[PDB]
Amino acid sequence: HRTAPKSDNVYLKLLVKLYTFLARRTDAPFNKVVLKALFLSKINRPPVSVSRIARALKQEGAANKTVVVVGTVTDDARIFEFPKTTVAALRFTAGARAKIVKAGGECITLDQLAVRAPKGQNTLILRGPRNSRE
Amino acid sequence: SRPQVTVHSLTGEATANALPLPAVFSAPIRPDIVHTVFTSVNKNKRQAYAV
Amino acid sequence: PILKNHFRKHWQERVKVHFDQAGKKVSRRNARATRAAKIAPRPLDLLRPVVRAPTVKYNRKVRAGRGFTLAEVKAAGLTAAYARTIGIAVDHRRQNRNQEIFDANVQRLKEYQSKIIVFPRNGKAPEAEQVLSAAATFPIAQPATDVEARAVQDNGESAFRTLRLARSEKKFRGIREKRAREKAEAE
Amino acid sequence: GMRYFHKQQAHFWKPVLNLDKLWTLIPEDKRDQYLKSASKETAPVIDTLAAGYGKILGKGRIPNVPVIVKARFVSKLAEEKIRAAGGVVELIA
Amino acid sequence: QVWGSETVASSKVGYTLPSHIISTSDVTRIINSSEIQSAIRPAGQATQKRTH
RNA sequence: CAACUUUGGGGCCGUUCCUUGUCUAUGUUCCUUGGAACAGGACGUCAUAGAGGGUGAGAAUCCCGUGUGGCGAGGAGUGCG
RNA sequence: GAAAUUGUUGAAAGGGAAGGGCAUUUGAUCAGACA
RNA sequence: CACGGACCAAGGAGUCUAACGUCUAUGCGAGUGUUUGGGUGUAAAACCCAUACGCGUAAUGAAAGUGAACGUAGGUUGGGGCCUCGCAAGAGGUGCACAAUCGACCGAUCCUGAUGUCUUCGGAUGGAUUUGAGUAAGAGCAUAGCUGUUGGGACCCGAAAG
């Protein structure tokens, strides 16, 4: 149904190649979810505000999970205290990355996530708010 | 740290001086972005033609 | 969708494309250079006054106006006829009802008079480099309306309620005065 | 309803700034030390007009640290949240 | 100085050099890491023996 | 009523502008082909000149030019030295 | 120096169409390969 | 049926533009947009840039106006992933997007009418429905591509003209 992205980005193609291998040969559903998410068009990869990451990390038993955002993580000045955590994202805005590091966290790419968490262990995939138009 | 780049004199010999590699040489190499920006910018010197 | 397209009015006879933008920019720079050569030591522009912009949207901003008022020039220590010949702009129709702007302009004129040399008319003039711009030399400075950090002076009365009482007294001034006149004629 | 002859958009200019975005107005370099100090003396002064807003609104929550907020207009609840934080609203002349 | 670095901001006002979305270009070194090689299942085999 | 400050007009020579003239690098060396070398090869030279055009076929180095500088001539000018 | 169109030469077909499809006869012509 | 076709060459008909959209790629992202203009230049290129402005971040009402947190930004149900035990089967927990419903918030509508007050001003507090591409930890701005609509000669030629 969908195998290749429409992006001509070389590095996005490398990420798709990497997680294609992982989702072929790991049987962990995280990698399949991420690979499915890599092909999404830009309207279907809404940005995930950094305050949404904090809200996800505020849940029960989710304080130390490594958040994964298959898309762009954006700043949110509406949040003042932000927790120290690890965030794997396709892209970070300068404000979002600066806030994550300022709280003591870390902004890692998706392949660094693949090295650290190859079967997607102890992760938390966030999807941004979707409704843009009709 | 950042790997050093040797500096050659006017006769081609490599002097002892070497320099850190600037951070723009670690920038992502995106042929698609270069392609689209070139193909737009390469239109900016054109002159109008008409009958 | 609802969208208006005004292109039925023989518009093709009046389509202006700005292919000359780069050529006009080069010609403009050439004109600036040649005018600077013509006026050789003088700057390209005239000393413009400091002005507070008109409307509620822009009265927060201070802008470079047209020319110094007669009051500003006299308070600076020179006549308007002479001021116009030392590169100072004089505006006869601008009025002064603001001491801050008046003093700011007088201070601009005081600084301007000292930062320039005026060559003697007779001859043997001293050498002076041409400075092209006087607006870059004497930029318009935004006044600082308050210091960075202050004490919290709580009066106790709400700000919103102050605005609503202001709007109310604006609303009912006329009928209140009418009732006052009626009670006055009724003693 | 009515029909409004000769609209001038100068006198109906009134941008809104909610309370959540209020602390963005303080420069980013000094913001963290203003959060850390939290003092009723030397509280920071925000002139929203100079920043280009007309009315302050009460959407977000602001940190419980005082701040002197200067604006042309504030909503009732914006007033309440600013005062309840130890700050105050001074109407801009 | 012209294009900035992680130490000097830039001569271009508000410019920061682009950020990689993949840490390393070589994907085969990633796939042949100890962690990936641990996670995956046995290889399979590429060219299939024709049955029937 | 009271004290201070300011000042024209020209002529000469330059400069500026305009319009013009002239001058200002380096192979036509060897070999083959061809009607013709401006082609191929070898060895060079000039380059702030490898834009362009001509010349018997794709010529920086043959010619005019180009590039860069010099020398003038006639004016306009009071802009100013 | 194309095609339409024409002359001559050589080959061929033609009992009120010509052309086209598949297959093969016949005539003319023609490419490729070394345990 | 009717219409076109004696033959050959060459020409010959969905183009460009503007304003809106849809989708996708790209850049940055509560921002975004250098290119009106200025600076610079190897000169219509490229490079650089202040102020402003546009759109977006706030809606609603005819308007004056007013203006988005009771709560872990909400309760239940469902929900990709993940976490715990388990060889596994499953058991539980957490639950993104989203969807359904019930609540909360902002404006509008109808009431009630406190603290007080130029005695008519103020709107406190608490209810009733409906209601909006409304809030409920932003998603936009710009560019490009394939394109849809509409207006221009508008796929090309041709109608009775004024």
Curated annotation (Swiss-Prot), chain A:
Gene Ontology biological-process entries: cytoplasmic translation
Glycyl lysine isopeptide (Lys-Gly) (interchain with G-Cter in ubiquitin), cross-linked positions: 102
TM helices/strands, residue ranges: none
Modified residues (N6,N6,N6-trimethyllysine): 36
Gene Ontology terms, MF aspect: RNA binding; structural constituent of ribosome
Record keywords, A-Z: Cytoplasm, Isopeptide bond, Methylation, Ribonucleoprotein, Ribosomal protein, Ubl conjugation
Localization annotation: Cytoplasm
GO cellular component, one term: cytosolic large ribosomal subunit
UniProt feature coiled coil, ranges: none
Complex formation: Component of the large ribosomal subunit (LSU). Mature yeast ribosomes consist of a small (40S) and a large (60S) subunit. The 40S small subunit contains 1 molecule of ribosomal RNA (18S rRNA) and 33 different proteins (encoded by 57 genes). The large 60S subunit contains 3 rRNA molecules (25S, 5.8S and 5S rRNA) and 46 different proteins (encoded by 81 genes). eL18 interacts with NAP1.
Summary of the function given for this chain in its UniProt record: Component of the ribosome, a large ribonucleoprotein complex responsible for the synthesis of proteins in the cell. The small ribosomal subunit (SSU) binds messenger RNAs (mRNAs) and translates the encoded message by selecting cognate aminoacyl-transfer RNA (tRNA) molecules. The large subunit (LSU) contains the ribosomal catalytic site termed the peptidyl transferase center (PTC), which catalyzes the formation of peptide bonds, thereby polymerizing the amino acids delivered by tRNAs into a polypeptide chain.
Similarity section: Belongs to the eukaryotic ribosomal protein eL18 family.
Miscellaneous: There are 2 genes for eL18 in yeast.
Name used for this protein in its record: Large ribosomal subunit protein eL18A
UniProtKB/Swiss-Prot annotation, chain C:
Phosphothreonine modification, residue list: 137, 145
PROSITE patterns (UniProt xref): RIBOSOMAL_L13E
Compartments (UniProt record): Cytoplasm
Keywords carried by this UniProt record: Cytoplasm, Phosphoprotein, Ribonucleoprotein, Ribosomal protein
UniProt entry tagged with the keyword Iron-sulfur: no
GO CC field: cytosol; cytosolic large ribosomal subunit
Any one GO MF annotation of this record: RNA binding
GO terms for biological process, alphabetical: cytoplasmic translation
Assembly description: Component of the large ribosomal subunit (LSU). Mature yeast ribosomes consist of a small (40S) and a large (60S) subunit. The 40S small subunit contains 1 molecule of ribosomal RNA (18S rRNA) and 33 different proteins (encoded by 57 genes). The large 60S subunit contains 3 rRNA molecules (25S, 5.8S and 5S rRNA) and 46 different proteins (encoded by 81 genes).
Function: Component of the ribosome, a large ribonucleoprotein complex responsible for the synthesis of proteins in the cell. The small ribosomal subunit (SSU) binds messenger RNAs (mRNAs) and translates the encoded message by selecting cognate aminoacyl-transfer RNA (tRNA) molecules. The large subunit (LSU) contains the ribosomal catalytic site termed the peptidyl transferase center (PTC), which catalyzes the formation of peptide bonds, thereby polymerizing the amino acids delivered by tRNAs into a polypeptide chain.
Misc: Present with 133000 molecules/cell in log phase SD medium. There are 2 genes for eL13 in yeast.
Family to which this protein belongs: Belongs to the eukaryotic ribosomal protein eL13 family.
Annotated protein name in UniProt: Large ribosomal subunit protein eL13A
Swiss-Prot record, chain D:
Source species, domain of life: Eukaryota
Protein name according to UniProt: Large ribosomal subunit protein uL15
GO MF annotation list: RNA binding; structural constituent of ribosome
Taxonomic placement: Eukaryota, Fungi, Dikarya, Ascomycota, Saccharomycotina
Gene: RPL28
Subunit: Component of the large ribosomal subunit (LSU). Mature yeast ribosomes consist of a small (40S) and a large (60S) subunit. The 40S small subunit contains 1 molecule of ribosomal RNA (18S rRNA) and 33 different proteins (encoded by 57 genes). The large 60S subunit contains 3 rRNA molecules (25S, 5.8S and 5S rRNA) and 46 different proteins (encoded by 81 genes).
Single Gene Ontology BP annotation: cytoplasmic translation
Secretion signal span: none
Similarity section: Belongs to the universal ribosomal protein uL15 family.
Keyword annotations: Cytoplasm, Isopeptide bond, Ribonucleoprotein, Ribosomal protein, Ubl conjugation
Keyword Nucleotide-binding attributed: no
CC per GO annotation: cytoplasm; cytosol; cytosolic large ribosomal subunit; nucleus
Ribosomal protein in keyword set: yes
From-to range in the entire protein, with total length: 57 to 149 of 149
UniProtKB/Swiss-Prot annotation, chain E:
Domain of life: Eukaryota
Coiled-coil stretches noted in the UniProt entry, renumbered to this chain: none
Note: There are 2 genes for uL4 in yeast.
UniProt similarity note: Belongs to the universal ribosomal protein uL4 family.
Role this protein plays: Component of the ribosome, a large ribonucleoprotein complex responsible for the synthesis of proteins in the cell. The small ribosomal subunit (SSU) binds messenger RNAs (mRNAs) and translates the encoded message by selecting cognate aminoacyl-transfer RNA (tRNA) molecules. The large subunit (LSU) contains the ribosomal catalytic site termed the peptidyl transferase center (PTC), which catalyzes the formation of peptide bonds, thereby polymerizing the amino acids delivered by tRNAs into a polypeptide chain.
Name of the protein: Large ribosomal subunit protein uL4A
Domain free text: The eukaryote-specific C-terminal extension harbors a nuclear import signal and delivers the ACL4-uL4/RPL4 complex to the pre-ribosome, triggering uL4 release from ACL4 and incorporation into the 60S ribosomal subunit.
Processing after translation: N-terminally acetylated by acetyltransferase NatA.
Section covered of the full-length record: 260 to 311 of 362
Localization in the cell: Cytoplasm; Nucleus
Consequence the record notes for mutating residue 30 to A: Leads to an inefficient release from ACL4 with a delayed assembly into the 60S subunit
